[PDB]
Design an enzyme around this catalytic site. Structure first.
Site, PDB file in Angstrom:
ATOM      1  N   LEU B  40       0.840  -1.187   0.000  1.00  0.00           N
ATOM      2  CA  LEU B  40       0.000   0.000   0.000  1.00  0.00           C
ATOM      3  C   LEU B  40       0.880   1.242   0.000  1.00  0.00           C
ATOM      4  O   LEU B  40       2.085   1.179   0.235  1.00  0.00           O
ATOM      5  CB  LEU B  40      -0.939   0.011   1.207  1.00  0.00           C
ATOM      6  CG  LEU B  40      -1.759  -1.246   1.474  1.00  0.00           C
ATOM      7  CD1 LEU B  40      -2.325  -1.214   2.876  1.00  0.00           C
ATOM      8  CD2 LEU B  40      -2.866  -1.382   0.462  1.00  0.00           C
ATOM      9  N   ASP B  41       0.266   2.381  -0.287  1.00  0.00           N
ATOM     10  CA  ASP B  41       0.977   3.649  -0.235  1.00  0.00           C
ATOM     11  C   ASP B  41       0.617   4.387   1.045  1.00  0.00           C
ATOM     12  O   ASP B  41      -0.027   3.827   1.926  1.00  0.00           O
ATOM     13  CB  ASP B  41       0.662   4.492  -1.469  1.00  0.00           C
ATOM     14  CG  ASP B  41      -0.781   4.944  -1.526  1.00  0.00           C
ATOM     15  OD1 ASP B  41      -1.394   4.806  -2.603  1.00  0.00           O
ATOM     16  OD2 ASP B  41      -1.299   5.461  -0.521  1.00  0.00           O
ATOM     17  N   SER B  42       1.032   5.641   1.152  1.00  0.00           N
ATOM     18  CA  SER B  42       0.823   6.385   2.373  1.00  0.00           C
ATOM     19  C   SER B  42      -0.579   6.976   2.436  1.00  0.00           C
ATOM     20  O   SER B  42      -1.114   7.165   3.551  1.00  0.00           O
ATOM     21  CB  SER B  42       1.859   7.491   2.496  1.00  0.00           C
ATOM     22  OG  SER B  42       1.727   8.323   1.385  1.00  0.00           O
ATOM     23  N   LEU B  43      -1.178   7.280   1.293  1.00  0.00           N
ATOM     24  CA  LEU B  43      -2.547   7.768   1.290  1.00  0.00           C
ATOM     25  C   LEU B  43      -3.449   6.683   1.844  1.00  0.00           C
ATOM     26  O   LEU B  43      -4.412   6.958   2.546  1.00  0.00           O
ATOM     27  CB  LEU B  43      -2.990   8.169  -0.112  1.00  0.00           C
ATOM     28  CG  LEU B  43      -2.506   9.535  -0.581  1.00  0.00           C
ATOM     29  CD1 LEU B  43      -2.546   9.617  -2.092  1.00  0.00           C
ATOM     30  CD2 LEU B  43      -3.339  10.637   0.039  1.00  0.00           C
ATOM     31  N   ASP B  44      -3.118   5.435   1.517  1.00  0.00           N
ATOM     32  CA  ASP B  44      -3.852   4.303   2.067  1.00  0.00           C
ATOM     33  C   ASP B  44      -3.613   4.164   3.561  1.00  0.00           C
ATOM     34  O   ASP B  44      -4.523   3.796   4.309  1.00  0.00           O
ATOM     35  CB  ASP B  44      -3.447   3.025   1.344  1.00  0.00           C
ATOM     36  CG  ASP B  44      -3.839   3.039  -0.106  1.00  0.00           C
ATOM     37  OD1 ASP B  44      -4.722   3.839  -0.467  1.00  0.00           O
ATOM     38  OD2 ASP B  44      -3.268   2.257  -0.890  1.00  0.00           O
TER      39      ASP B  44
END
Ligand code: CDL
Ligand code: PC1
Ligand code: 3PE
Ligand code: LMT
Ligand code: LMT
Ligand code: LMT
Lengths: 459, 86, 98, 172, 52, 63, 171
Positions: B40-44
């Site tokens: 996952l990314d950081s927005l997630d």
């Protein structure tokens, strides 16, 4: 008055001849016994004052002040014996001797029938008071505080001495009973304008009058606790008591000479109340609180009405016990954290729950919650100044609002919120500290049940 | 309010992550790094923290939130705040 | 500088005497100091003094004045005289100027 | 600002979602608009130009200020919430127990026996904790508030007492 | 009289002594005893002074 | 705190109760004076102008 | 009875006899009977016991009589001995007059409560009597100040007597 003067002097042999470890027990116990017998002064009559001899008399004005004075001596002994524990034994006995000698001058000052006998004792209280401040104060500034206290008072007193002696020359007597019958009216003239000022400025400085009050916050912040107790409770009232007596012979000139001083008091009381909202020093806050309260007393004495004189008499007694209690409360914090900074130690209701009750009761009397005698005195004054001029209710109203704001601000800042983390020496309140607080508030609240005995000669 | 437990907190932290369409519920474990393992990314990750706040009814400040990078770290953070010791 | 004694530490009266009343370091003196303050302060001055004040005989004759006023109103109304005249002093005993 | 660019964007994203939630109230409606709001962040996710990326952040913050809810939702125990600091009046520092009267301590013989071990453990560890901070701190003092862990067995992390023994969040 | 309790008579004696001196002052101020217009009367058969 | 309030109560009640009981017995068995006319040729003592016996005692003993 | 009905008058009581127009029992009737049984009787006997002890120890107190002395008008100037007695007498009369106004005020307030919604018309005598006495009290004592004396009172009267004389001269 010899039944009070002599046993007061005998407290000095008692203290000096007591065993080394009993000086506080003996002096405290026997000064309480003297306080008990002072209630006999309440043999007051509707028409005549109680005149004992050519030297001393006691009316309804001096009787409550005498009882306040003699009650305060045991309280001052209790309040001092902690911070004087490490003191040298002889220097402990000399400290107690200064307090006993102050009581002696005080009870003679309030009962002197002759005004020049009143002047000498009125002045004599300076020496023990000054020595207490400068010898047993803690800070460097206690020396400057002594000088301001000494020279503010003397600047006013010395003119008063000239005026009284001039009055004795022209009238032939300074006996207060004689003045009641031989009083003549004062007619306008620059000569009488300065006779009026000389007769009133010495007392205005003691109250103090706004503008001339700078000595008072200095003295309180530097005095030891016992010094602050007597200063606020009694020595300020020497100004009020003196004014209530001398105004007899200043009529009708008081009609227009009062205006500059009513203006200073009416506006000054709002100014000193607002100063309390921004004080950083807890003792200095209480000192400035006294200036605001004593402003009402000055106005009441100067408008010269039966209701205003009753109100002034109650205010002086009520303020005496409340301000003395507040200084004692702040001191108990100081004996723990050793600073007077108000914001230093917060949230103390969590650590000292019962001492927080005393803080609450002391604050409620300071803001004049009815039916306390603080409210009775303040209300009677407001009724009379309203008749003097309706617009005064505006200034009286605002002061009542600001008085509540700083009284509860002091309560909230020190007692509520979160406790200060790093301060970890808040020990549980001692029995001595709790008994000291209760001996202030209980008599103050009891007097509500029977307020006529503190309403003065015009009741 | 019923008390929390370390086992109880873990169950609900995993429970919430199994209802997130971007994670594989079989591949999920208490020790799965949200980017290195789950990709996952950081927005997630902000959304995951947001959902944990909604799950337990209290806020994790952004300074603290950006460090919680696997389910075990969240379980530890919640337990410390709620004085959960088992 | 100089040769000076360092500032001594703070003494907690509770450490040596957990039952301290805060009066004295000596427990026996500390108990006596508490006893005289409470007995003479509360039991005597405040309790007896309060009782003494409550039973003061007609402090400043307020009750007599009320009884006397009743006597006067009873008399004056019966005899048809004014309850109270505007003149405090008999005008025949006064000699106005002019 | 000591916050990097990434931290500002992530903080704005969270704050924008929470204020969006306050407007929408209903969960289905919030889900619809949170996804459109996420789509907007994904639109510029790969913007490699810092100058443009910073410019996008400025306008985004400007838009958030115009659209923020005047009365947003706050978790009750969060700063500004209706239960913030509600229980501070019940949190009493542990040093208050040293002042308890012996008759008060006798009621909890087991609790105060354990408490002594912790106080014993605190005295023994202190010297090593001060020493560890002396050896790890560069000349000129620390530069950050971060504290080191313990480096050996039997060592406790320096400055631990007031974290370990702090009052419970629901004390009484 | 005890070696611990003789200092406790000083203040009580001072009060008694002061009380006594206060009453002796009244013996110097009898110029108007039974002579004021308000209270002047005739002595009772055994009375020697209306007040002492 | 509790110790002070227990001591405060004990020393208030140490005299308060005997005083309250003593007052009750005075009010009941002695009672108050009755208002009367001054008999012709009779000169009341200064303490006979008060009603309550405790007030009469205070005026007689101290005033 | 206990006070003087002349000083504190109460108009004769007029109580309507009960006229129950309902079959239901009246709650007030039975509570009244319970109050007499449970409260009045035990309280009455306890009082009669106390009234027996008082009758065995009957003693009297008196209302002080103050002889009249010459007022301040008869005093030579600066003669303190005569001034003192006149001054004390004037002070005693000042207190008594204060309680006279209190009695008339008490009548006025008792009438206002007693008459209810009709007080405006049924308390005209009390209002008139109160208005007159307050005028007399104001003339004697108002505006004298905290340091009032018989001398200041006399000076105020003389000033009032002078004004009345001059207006009469205009007539
Ligand atoms: C605190 C300050 C203390 C200072 C010292 C006290 C001074 C003192 O002793 O005076 C007390 C005073 C003594 O009066 P006194 O001058 O000695 O009586 C002379 C008479 O001849 C007495 O006449 P008596 O002989 O008929 O009464 C004597 C009485 C004995 O009464 C007493 O002695 C009680 C004294 C208690 C001590 C005071 C504490 O005899 C009885 O035992 C009657 C018992 C009846 C039971 C049924 O008595 C009291 O007032 C005690 C309280 C009275 C009862 C309260 C009245 C009912 C409440 C009504 C007001 C509240 C309304 C509801 C509003 C609530 C707020 C929202
Ligand atoms: C019930 C509802 C709750 C009411 C609140 C509780 C309070 C009421 C309880 C009291 C009931 C009894 C009562 O009121 O009668 C008491 C009465 C008041 O009512 P009283 O005036 O009618 O007296 C009753 C007795 N007879 C009938 C004979 C008149 O007396 C007192 O109030 C005592 C006054 C005490 C004040 C004196 C203080 C002591 C002085 C010590 C010296 C040191 C002080 C510091 C110096 C100060 C300067 C002067
Ligand atoms: C300050 C010190 C430095 C300055 C020197 C002070 C002295 C100068 C003050 C002058 C005041 C005016 C004055 O002295 O009045 C004189 C007046 C003389 O009048 P006489 O002739 O005796 O009576 C018949 C009248 N044809 O006297 C009288 O008539 C009676 C007056 C009574 C005595 C007045 C005493 C003078 C008071 C001056 C100070 C008052 C203000 C105090 C300020 C205090 C501030 C803290
Ligand atoms: C805190 C400080 C407060 C300061 C208060 C200031 C109050 C000012 C009062 C001014 C009025 C003084 O009183 C006034 O003095 C002069 C004295 O010369 C008197 O008048 C006398 O001198 C004047 C000369 O000026 C003559 O014209 C006049 O014929 C003569 O009788 C007035 O009859 C009197 O009304
Ligand atoms: C009408 C006036 C009434 C005045 C009342 C004054 C009350 C004063 C109360 C103080 C009473 C204390 O009385 C006390 O008794 C004992 C025995 O004799 C004395 O001696 C005691 O000293 C110490 C106390 O430090 C004791 O531990 C020891 O057991 C005993 O020798 C004390 O030195 C004395 O202080
Ligand atoms: C418990 C609280 C204590 C507070 C302090 C007060 C202590 C004194 C209380 C009692 C005072 C004595 O009470 C006293 O009773 C007697 C009744 O006989 C009264 O005396 C009266 O009756 C006696 C007959 O007995 C006759 O001599 C005479 O008719 C009259 O003097 C006194 O006027 C009163 O003073």
């Amino acid at each position: 008055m010899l039944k009070y003067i002599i046993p007061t002097i005998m407290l000095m042999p008692l203290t000096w001849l007591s065993k080394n470890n009993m000086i506080w027990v003996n002096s405290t116990a026997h000064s309480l016994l003297i306080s008990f017998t002072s209630l006999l002064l309440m043999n007051q009559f509707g028409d005549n004052s109680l005149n004992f001899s050519l030297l001393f008399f006691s009316d309804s004005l001096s009787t409550p002040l005498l009882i306040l004075t003699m009650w305060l001596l045991p309280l001052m002994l209790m309040a001092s014996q902690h911070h004087l524990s490490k003191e040298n034994l002889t220097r402990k006995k000399l400290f107690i001797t200064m307090l006993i000698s102050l009581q002696l001058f005080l009870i003679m000052t309030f009962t002197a029938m002759e005004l020049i006998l009143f002047y000498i004792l009125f002045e004599a209280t300076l020496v023990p008071t000054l020595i207490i401040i400068t010898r047993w104060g803690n800070q460097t500034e206690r020396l400057n505080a002594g000088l301001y206290f000494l020279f503010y008072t003397l600047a006013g007193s010395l003119p008063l001495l000239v005026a009284l002696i001039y009055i004795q020359n022209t009238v032939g007597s300074l006996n207060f009973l004689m003045l009641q019958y031989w009083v003549q009216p004062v007619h306008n003239s620059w000569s009488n304008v300065f006779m009026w000022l000389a007769c009133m400025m010495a007392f205005m400085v003691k109250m103090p009058l706004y503008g001339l009050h700078l000595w008072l916050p200095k003295a309180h912040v530097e005095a030891p606790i016992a010094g602050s107790m007597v200063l606020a409770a009694v020595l300020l009232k020497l100004g009020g008591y003196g004014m209530l007596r001398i105004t007899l012979i200043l009529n009708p000139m008081t009609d227009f000479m009062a205006y500059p001083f009513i203006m200073l008091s009416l506006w000054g009381m709002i100014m000193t109340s607002s100063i309390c909202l921004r004080q950083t020093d807890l003792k200095s806050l209480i000192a400035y609180s006294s200036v605001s309260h004593m402003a009402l007393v000055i106005v009441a004495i100067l408008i010269q009405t039966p209701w205003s004189y009753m109100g002034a008499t109650a205010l002086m007694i009520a303020h005496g016990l409340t301000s003395s209690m507040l200084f004692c409360l702040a001191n108990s914090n100081y004996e723990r954290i050793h600073s007077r900074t108000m914001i230093l130690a917060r949230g103390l209701q969590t650590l000292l729950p019962l001492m927080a009750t005393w803080w609450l009761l002391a604050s409620l009397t300071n803001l004049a919650l009815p039916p306390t005698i603080n409210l009775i005195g303040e209300l009677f004054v407001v009724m009379s100044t309203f008749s003097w001029s309706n617009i005064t209710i505006i200034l009286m109203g605002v002061n009542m609002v600001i008085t509540a704001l700083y009284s509860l601000y002091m309560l909230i800042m020190t007692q509520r919120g979160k406790y200060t983390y790093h301060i970890n020496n808040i020990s549980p309140s001692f029995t001595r500290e709790n008994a000291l607080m209760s001996l202030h508030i209980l008599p103050l609240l009891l007097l509500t049940l029977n307020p006529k005995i503190i309403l003065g000669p015009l009741y | 309010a019923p008390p929390l437990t370390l086992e109880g907190i873990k169950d609900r932290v995993l429970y919430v992550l199994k209802l997130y369409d971007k994670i594989d519920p079989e591949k999920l474990s208490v020790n799965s790094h949200f980017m290195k393992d789950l990709g996952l990314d950081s927005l997630d990750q902000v959304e995951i923290i947001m959902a944990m706040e909604d799950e337990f009814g209290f806020e994790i400040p952004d300074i603290d939130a950006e460090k919680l990078m696997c389910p075990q770290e969240i379980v530890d953070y919640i337990a410390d705040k709620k004085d959960v010791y088992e | 500088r100089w040769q000076e004694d360092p500032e001594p530490e703070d003494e907690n009266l509770y450490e040596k005497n957990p039952d301290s009343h805060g009066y004295d370091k000596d427990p026996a003196v500390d108990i006596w100091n508490m006893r005289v303050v409470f007995f003479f302060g509360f039991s005597i001055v405040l309790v007896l003094g309060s009782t003494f004040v409550a039973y003061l005989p007609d402090y400043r004759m307020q009750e007599w004045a009320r009884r006397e006023a009743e006597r006067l109103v009873k008399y004056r109304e019966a005899h048809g005289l004014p309850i109270m005249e505007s003149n405090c002093f008999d005008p025949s005993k006064i000699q106005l100027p002019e | 600002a000591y916050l990097t660019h990434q931290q500002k964007v992530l903080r704005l994203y969270k704050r924008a979602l929470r204020h969006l939630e306050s407007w929408c109230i209903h969960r289905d409606k919030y889900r619809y608009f949170a996804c459109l709001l996420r789509a907007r962040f994904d639109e510029h996710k790969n913007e490699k130009d810092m100058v443009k990326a910073t410019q996008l952040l400025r306008e985004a913050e400007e838009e958030f200020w115009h659209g923020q809810h005047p009365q947003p939702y706050i978790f009750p125990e969060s700063p500004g919430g209706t239960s913030y600091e509600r229980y501070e009046c019940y949190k009493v520092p542990e040093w208050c127990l040293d002042d308890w009267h012996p008759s008060e301590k006798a009621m909890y013989p087991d609790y105060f026996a354990k408490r002594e071990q912790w106080k014993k453990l605190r005295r023994e560890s202190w010297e090593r904790e001060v020493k560890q901070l002396q050896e790890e701190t560069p000349v000129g003092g620390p530069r950050t508030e971060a504290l080191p862990p313990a480096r050996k067995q039997g060592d406790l992390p320096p400055l631990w007492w007031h974290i370990v023994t702090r009052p419970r969040e629901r004390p009484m | 009289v005890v070696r611990d309790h003789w200092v406790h008579v000083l203040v009580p004696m001072g009060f008694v002594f002061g009380y006594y001196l206060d009453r002796k002052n009244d013996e110097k101020l009898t110029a108007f005893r039974n002579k004021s217009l308000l209270y002047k009367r005739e002595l009772k058969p055994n009375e020697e002074v209306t007040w002492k | 705190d509790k110790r002070f309030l227990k001591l405060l109560r004990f020393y208030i009640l140490l005299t308060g109760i005997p005083v309250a009981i003593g007052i009750t017995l005075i009010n009941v068995f002695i009672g108050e004076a009755e208002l009367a006319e001054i008999p012709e040729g009779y000169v009341p003592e200064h303490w006979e102008y008060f009603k309550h016996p405790i007030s009469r005692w205070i005026a007689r003993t101290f005033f | 009875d206990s006070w003087d009905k002349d000083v504190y008058p109460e108009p004769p009581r007029r109580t309507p006899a009960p006229s129950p127009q309902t079959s239901l029992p009246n709650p007030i009737t039975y509570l009244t009977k319970a109050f007499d049984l449970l409260v009045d009787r035990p309280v009455t006997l306890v009082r009669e016991f106390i009234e027996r002890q008082h009758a065995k120890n009957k003693y009297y107190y008196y209302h002080r009589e103050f002889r009249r002395v010459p007022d301040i008008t008869e005093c030579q100037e600066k003669d303190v001995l005569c001034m003192f007695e006149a001054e004390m007498q004037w002070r005693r009369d000042y207190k008594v007059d204060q309680e006279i106004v209190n009695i008339i005020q008490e009548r006025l307030k008792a009438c206002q409560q007693r008459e209810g919604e009709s007080h405006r018309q049924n308390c005209a005598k009390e209002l008139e009597q109160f208005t007159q006495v307050v005028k007399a009290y104001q003339d004697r004592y108002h505006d004298l100040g905290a340091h009032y004396s018989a001398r200041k009172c006399l000076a105020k009267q003389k000033q009032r007597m002078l004004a009345e004389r001059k207006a009469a001269k205009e007539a």
